[model samples]
Target chain A: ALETLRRVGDGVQRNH
Target chain B: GDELYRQSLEIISRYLREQATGAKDTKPMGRSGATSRKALETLRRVGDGVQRNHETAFQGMLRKLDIKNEDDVKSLSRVMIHVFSDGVTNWGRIVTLISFGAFVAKHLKTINQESCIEPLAESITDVLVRTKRDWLVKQRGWDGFVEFFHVEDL
Candidate 1:
């Protein structure tokens, strides 16, 4: 299972 | 959800053409379509996960209360918070408060209730009664702290 995304930075980095 | 993603992309492209993860592009401020569409998609997924986590925790609380259905416990919680006649549909708000109260009450018993309550109250009061200091010593500096709080709709 994929772990929960905790940081807003994670989404930003991944999308970037 | 997939349909929503496609709609978001179309709306996003209409405002400005910028690859989602492949390009650094400036969005138009007046239209704000690109950023707004992306924000909604991200927020929708995050909101779904948050709601699921709340329900899971609520289910665990129900287990502690020896109840099978969250609905029954939630209704009981609504009455406890005196929200039965308020015409508000947000059960999560009151239920979460009750859950937090239960947690504190459980721990406070072990530490002795009256003594704990006074200290806890004093600590919270200290935070509430304090004047925030201006930390900036320079012109054009941001000095105030930003307090962020939110309510979830599920």
Candidate 2:
């Protein structure tokens, strides 16, 4: 779940 | 809107859990459940604050932009997606910034050019700065601030 969260964060970060 | 809000909640919840546990290795393990619960509460507060103000801010943007037609509404929506997708990381701030960008885009009548683009960029900056004075600033610190102004390389 935590890794999934980090992946989500990375997805958001890549928005730029 | 509700979908975005739900996703935001999940992401924030996971982040709090990671921060609360000094979890190492490939997965997060809550070493201190009490601290994790506190962090969860804090994250919830921030999420609630964003939810509470989102509609009001969105309505304010509509008024500010004076949306008068389908075209204006469409334009605003397009600009919002562009701004949020390209310029923001924090999902809570994304709600505010997208609305602000829609207002700016509607007023300027286009998302292209420095004349229109610069103001849109500035408004997001202003929002981040202003939000820093609020509780989120203390809760999430600088990382809480929304990132990006304009698309790189024009």
Candidate 3:
């Protein structure tokens, strides 16, 4: 879950 | 997407470069009413594709998110931002795209921007607002929507 959240954050940044 | 645009731009350039080609003349004729019926038909098909693309992209995103029903996430995001700035960050892109769509729908002569764009935007917004509310209600139930849980913490 922590990893997924981190990935989501990373994804958000990458997406931007 | 950029590549496709470049290729299409080339086609547009061809229309501009060639003086005798049928495409350029046809475009002018349709807008000017010399070939309005045929021009209008071609424009309508292109407009339909544009509308279809947005809906298609919207559905694809929903499916990727594992959304089972039409959640109106795009519109809901706008409302969330409008009402509460920090809720559902993913909505920013949706709202922006929808906004761009509105701009195109309004300014682009291909579609009835007044009738189609705002109506769709509002409809999506309404559906998304309800979806967010529903999710919030569900989160408040028995489980109380755990903000964080740890297997090792126990």
Among these predictions, the greatest DockQ belongs to 3
Q: How many backbone clashes does candidate 3 have?
A: 0
Task: Give the runs in model 3 whose Cα sits over 4 Å from its true position.
Answer: A1-16, B1-89, B96-100, B103-109, B134-154
The model with the greater TM-score, 2 or 3, is 2
- The positional error of residue B90 in candidate 1, measured at the CA in angstroms, is 25
Candidate 2 residues B1-154, lDDT tens each? 3332233333333442232233422444344444434434443444334324454544554565554444454454444434434333454444344333433443444323324333344434343344323443454433333223222355
Cα RMSD for predicted model 2: 18.0
TM-score of chain B of 3: 0.24
Candidate 3 chain B, poorest ten consecutive residues by summed lDDT: B141-150
Question: In model 1, where do residues sit more than 4 Å from their true spots?
Answer: A1-16, B1-105, B131-147, B152-154
DockQ for each of the predicted structures, in order? Answer: 0.04, 0.03, 0.05
lDDT of each residue in B1-154, candidate 3, tens digit only: 3332232223223222221122343344322233233323422333233335455443443344331222433443343244333344332232233332332333322332233333434433342344344543454311121221102345
Candidate 2: regions farther than 4 A off: A1-16, B1-94, B99-114, B145-154
Chain A TM-score, cand. 3: 0.54
Cα lDDT listed for each candidate: 0.30, 0.39, 0.32
Best by lDDT: 2
